[PDB]
C-alpha cells in the first residue's frame, strides 16, 4: 500500500478531445495510433522528426459511410498475414433510427496494389453489414488452416454469442461464418463477453483462450489447432463485471483477471495447477474501479510488470518478487512499484514505440484526451551507458 520508489515516466504531449471515448476506443495502426471518439471523430497520432527534435502530430481522419447522427461503439485494426499484405480497419457503430438503435459494422481494406497501407485511401473502401445485435468488442485472432495462417475478426454480441468474420479470397469481402468451426471453446455462453483474449503459442500449434463476462464468469481453455479440440478447460465465477483478462508468462503460463468491485488477481501455472494458485495484487482496489490493464516491461529489467488504471485516476504499477530472490517470509508475490495520478478517469492504454528510438512510449487515453508518457531520458541514458561499458569490459576480459 506504499510505493517503493518514484515514477520514471515524464509526460511529453497532451491532445485534447472534444468528447469522450470508451474502453474500446483505442487501437493500433501501421508506428501510428488511432483513437476514436464517441461522436464519429477519429484521430491519428504520430511523430515527425525535425533535424534535432521531434514534433507530435495529431491529424483527423474521415471514413466513408458513417452518418453524422451515428454513434461509434468500437474500433479495431490489424495487419494481414505474412503471405498477404495490407492493413484492415473495422468500426462498429449505431445509427439512431428514430427511437431504436440500428447497429452496423464497416470493414475498410484497400485492395489496389501500392495503396494497401495508405490510411487515407483505406478510409473510403468500406463494406456495410447489419447486425441484429448490439456489439460489444471487436478483436482479431490468427488461426492456422492447411499450411498457412489467416486473421479473422471476432465480435461479441448482445445475444450471448461470438460472431466470426472471415475474408473470402474469391470476391474479396468479409463474410460471417459459424464460430464453432475454428473456436470450439467460444460456444455455449450465457452472458455478454466484455473482454476476450486469445494467446497463441509460438513455434507450436496450441493456444489459450480466456474470456470474462458481465456476470463475472471467467473461462480459460487450453486448445489445440491441428485437431480443433479442447485439450482442457477451466472456469470460475467472481463478482462484478470482468473488465480485463490477459495471458502472460511470469518467467509456465498465468492469467491476470481485473474485475471492478474486487482487487485484480493473477492465477499462476495454468497448465499445471488450473485456477487454484491465486495471488492478489495488494491495495489495487482503493482507487475506485479498474478500467484498463497492461502487462509489459515498464522497468527495463527484462521481465514484465503489471499496470492498472482506475476510474479514480490512478496508474498503479506492480512488480513480482521472484522466489529466486529467496525471501519466503514475504514470499514470491506482487508489491506496489510506483504510482502516478491524473486529472480525468483513465480509459485505455498502449505500449508502443512512437518516437522511433527503440524506447517504448506509453499512450494513455483518458476522458479529456490522449497523454503520451516517456521514460525519463536522463535515467534511460545513464542506464544504457553502464550496460554498454560493462559489455565492452566483459568482451575485453573474455577475449584478451
Amino acid at each position: 500500500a506504499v510505493a517503493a520508489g518514484p515514477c520514471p515516466l515524464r509526460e511529453d504531449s497532451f491532445t485534447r478531445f472534444s468528447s469522450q471515448s470508451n474502453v474500446y476506443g483505442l487501437a493500433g495502426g501501421a508506428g501510428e495510433l488511432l483513437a476514436a471518439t464517441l461522436k464519429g471523430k477519429v484521430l491519428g497520432f504520430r511523430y515527425q522528426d525535425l533535424r534535432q527534435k521531434i514534433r507530435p502530430v495529431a491529424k483527423e481522419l474521415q471514413f466513408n459511410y458513417i452518418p453524422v447522427d451515428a454513434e461509434i461503439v468500437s474500433i479495431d485494426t490489424f495487419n494481414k498475414s505474412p503471405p498477404k499484405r495490407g492493413l484492415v480497419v473495422g468500426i462498429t457503430f449505431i445509427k439512431d433510427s428514430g427511437d431504436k438503435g440500428s447497429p452496423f459494422l464497416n470493414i475498410y481494406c484497400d485492395y489496389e496494389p501500392g495503396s494497401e497501407y495508405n490510411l487515407d485511401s483505406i478510409a473510403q473502401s468500406c463494406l456495410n453489414l447489419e447486425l441484429q445485435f448490439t456489439p460489444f468488442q471487436l478483436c482479431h485472432a490468427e488461426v492456422q488452416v492447411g499450411d498457412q495462417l489467416e486473421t479473422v475478426f471476432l465480435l461479441s454480441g448482445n445475444d450471448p454469442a461470438i460472431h466470426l468474420y472471415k475474408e473470402n479470397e474469391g470476391l474479396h469481402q468479409f463474410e460471417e461464418q459459424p464460430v464453432e468451426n475454428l473456436f470450439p471453446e467460444l460456444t455455449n455462453l450465457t452472458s455478454s463477453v466484455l473482454w476476450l483474449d486469445v494467446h497463441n503459442f509460438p513455434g507450436t500449434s496450441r493456444r489459450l483462450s480466456a474470456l470474462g463476462c458481465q456476470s463475472g464468469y471467467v473461462r480459460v481453455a487450453h486448445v489445440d489447432q491441428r485437431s480443433r479440440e479442447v485439450l482442457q478447460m477451466w472456469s470460475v465465477l467472481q463478482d462484478g463485471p470482468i473488465s480485463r483478462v490477459i495471458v502472460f508468462s511470469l518467467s509456465e503460463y498465468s492469467v491476470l483477471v481485473a474485475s471492478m468491485l474486487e482487487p485484480a488477481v493473477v492465477y499462476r501455472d495454468l497448465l499445471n495447477r488450473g485456477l487454484e494458485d491465486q495471488l492478489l495484487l495488494p491495495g489495487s482496489d482503493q482507487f475506485d474501479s479498474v478500467l484498463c490493464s497492461l502487462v509489459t516491461d515498464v522497468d527495463l529489467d527484462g521481465r514484465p510488470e503489471v499496470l492498472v488504471a482506475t476510474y479514480g485516476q490512478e496508474l498503479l504499477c506492480y512488480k513480482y518478487r521472484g522466489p529466486e530472490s529467496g525471501l519466503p517470509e514475504a514470499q514470491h508475490g506482487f508489491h506496489l512499484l510506483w504510482q502516478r495520478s491524473f486529472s480525468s478517469p483513465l480509459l485505455a492504454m498502449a505500449h508502443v514505440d512512437l518516437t522511433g528510438d527503440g524506447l517504448q512510449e506509453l499512450a494513455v487515453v483518458s476522458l479529456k484526451g490522449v497523454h503520451i508518457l516517456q521514460h525519463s531520458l536522463i535515467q534511460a541514458s545513464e542506464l544504457v551507458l553502464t550496460r554498454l561499458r560493462h559489455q565492452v569490459e566483459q568482451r575485453r576480459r573474455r577475449l584478451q
Binding site: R10, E11, D12, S13, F14, T15, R16, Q52, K53, I54, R55, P56, D297, L300, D301, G302, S341, F342, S343, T355, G356, D357, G358, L359, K368, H371, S376, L377, I378, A380, S381, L383, V384, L385, R387, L388, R389, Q391, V392, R395
Partner: protein, 384 residues
C-alpha cells in the same frame, strides 16, 4: 508547441473580490519559506501557509485594499508585509515571532501598482507607487520612522506595471509600461521621462511588463538585462536592454487576452522562463529560445501569480497560482519539467562523445540507424 497537463494542486477557500494586483507570494514571517498573501476588497488580508484550506492568519486594515507586498522597506534587514489601500493609506505588519498594523501613514490616493526595490543604487530600498492617472511617485523610509517623498513623474499613456532592470552599465533602471506596446524610463535625478516604442495595430492596448530576468546560476544579484512585454491583443515580446538600442530577442503572436506576466524557473537549469496567462485560463511558458509550452485550465481566471511556494515537506518549489470565480484558488506545485523541447533518445545520446567512442570500439558504425535501433532494444529490454 507541446501542451502538458499538470495534475497535483491544492485548493484554497477565498470569499471576496480583488484586483489583479492584490496577490503576492513571499516570506512574511522570515523563515526562508514562502507564504501566500491575498488582499480582499473588504479590508482584510489573508495569509495562507503550507497546504491548509483555511487562511493561516488574517490581518484587518481599513479601507479597500489595492496593493500588497512583502519586502524590507524599512531597510532593517527583516521582511515586512506592506499594504496600500485605495484611499491613500499605508499599513505595515510584522509577523515574525486580528493583527493590527504596527504603522500607518496617509499618502496620495488612487494607487494602482507598487514596487519595493533599491533604484538609485545607494544600498537602501526605495518604494515606488504608480497611480491610476499616469502619475508615478517615489518614497524612501527615513528614521525619525516615516516615509518621505522623492521625485515624481507624469506620463501620458496609462501605467500598468513597474519594474527595475539592470541598465546598459551596471546600474538599476526604473521602467514603466506605456500603452501601444511601449514603455518609459524614469530617471532618478537626485527630460525626466524617456519614452520608447517597439508592428502595432491599436494605440490603446493595455500593456504589461516584467524585467530583471535571470540568465544563469548564481548570477541573480550579479546582473540582469532582459525584459518582456505583453499586450492585451495577444502579443509577447522578449528583448534585451544593452547600450545602443534595445535588441529584440523574440516576438510571439497568440489569439487570447493576455493580462498577466511573470517569470519562473521550471526546468531548474538557472535560466528563468516567461509565464503569461489569458482571461480564459490558457497559460504559456516560453524560454529564451521561443520554445513554447501550453497549459489550459478549464475555468475563468480573476487573478494570476507564479513563484516559489512552500506547500509540502517544508520545501520551496515553483508554483502556479490561479484565482477562480468559484471562491477558490488553485496552487499547482509540481510544474517542474525535465526539458522544454522534445527529443527521443538517439539525439540525446548522440551529443555525448563517450557513446560514440564506446560504439566505435564495438565495431558497429553508428550511421546505420536500424542497426543501432536493434542494439538499443537489445540493451534496454534483453539485458541478458
Amino acid at each position: 508547441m507541446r501542451s502538458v497537463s499538470y495534475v497535483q494542486r491544492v485548493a484554497l477557500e477565498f470569499s471576496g473580490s480583488l484586483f489583479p494586483h492584490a496577490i503576492c507570494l513571499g516570506d512574511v514571517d522570515n523563515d526562508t519559506l514562502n507564504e501566500l498573501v491575498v488582499g480582499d476588497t473588504s479590508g482584510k488580508v489573508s495569509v495562507y501557509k503550507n497546504d491548509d484550506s483555511r487562511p493561516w492568519l488574517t490581518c484587518s486594515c481599513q479601507g479597500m485594499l489595492t496593493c500588497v507586498g512583502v519586502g524590507d522597506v524599512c531597510n532593517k534587514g527583516k521582511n515586512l508585509l506592506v499594504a496600500v489601500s485605495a484611499e491613500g493609506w499605508f499599513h505595515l505588519f510584522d509577523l515574525t515571532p486580528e493583527q493590527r498594523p504596527v504603522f500607518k501613514q496617509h499618502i496620495p490616493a488612487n494607487t494602482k501598482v507598487m514596487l519595493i526595490s533599491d533604484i538609485d543604487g545607494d544600498g537602501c530600498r526605495e518604494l515606488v507607487v504608480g497611480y491610476t492617472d499616469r502619475v508615478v511617485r517615489a518614497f524612501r523610509w527615513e528614521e525619525l520612522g516615516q516615509l518621505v517623498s522623492l521625485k515624481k513623474w507624469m506620463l501620458e499613456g496609462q501605467v500598468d506595471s513597474l519594474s527595475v532592470t539592470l541598465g546598459p552599465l551596471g546600474l538599476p533602471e526604473l521602467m514603466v509600461s506605456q500603452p501601444g506596446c511601449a514603455y518609459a524610463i524614469l530617471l532618478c535625478t537626485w527630460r525626466d521621462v524617456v519614452l520608447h516604442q517597439t508592428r502595432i495595430h491599436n494605440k490603446n492596448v493595455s500593456t504589461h511588463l516584467i524585467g530583471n530576468i535571470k540568465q544563469g546560476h548564481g548570477t541573480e544579484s550579479s546582473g540582469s538585462g532582459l525584459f518582456a512585454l505583453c499586450t492585451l491583443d495577444g502579443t509577447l515580446k522578449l528583448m534585451e536592454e544593452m547600450e545602443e538600442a534595445d535588441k529584440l530577442l523574440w516576438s510571439v503572436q497568440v489569439d487570447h487576452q493576455l493580462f498577466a506576466l511573470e517569470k519562473l524557473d521550471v526546468t531548474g537549469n538557472g535560466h528563468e522562463e516567461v509565464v503569461a496567462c489569458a482571461w480564459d485560463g490558457q497559460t504559456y511558458i516560453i524560454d529564451h529560445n521561443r520554445t513554447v509550452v501550453r497549459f489550459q485550465v478549464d475555468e475563468n481566471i480573476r487573478a494570476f501569480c507564479a513563484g516559489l511556494y512552500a506547500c509540502k515537506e517544508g520545501r520551496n518549489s515553483p508554483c502556479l497560482v490561479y484565482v477562480t470565480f468559484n471562491q477558490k484558488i488553485y496552487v499547482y506545485w509540481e510544474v517542474q519539467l525535465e526539458r522544454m523541447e522534445s527529443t527521443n533518445l538517439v539525439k540525446l545520446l548522440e551529443t555525448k562523445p563517450e557513446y560514440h567512442s564506446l560504439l566505435q570500439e564495438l565495431g558497429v558504425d553508428p550511421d546505420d540507424l536500424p542497426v543501432t535501433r536493434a542494439l538499443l532494444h537489445q540493451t534496454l529490454y534483453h539485458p541478458d
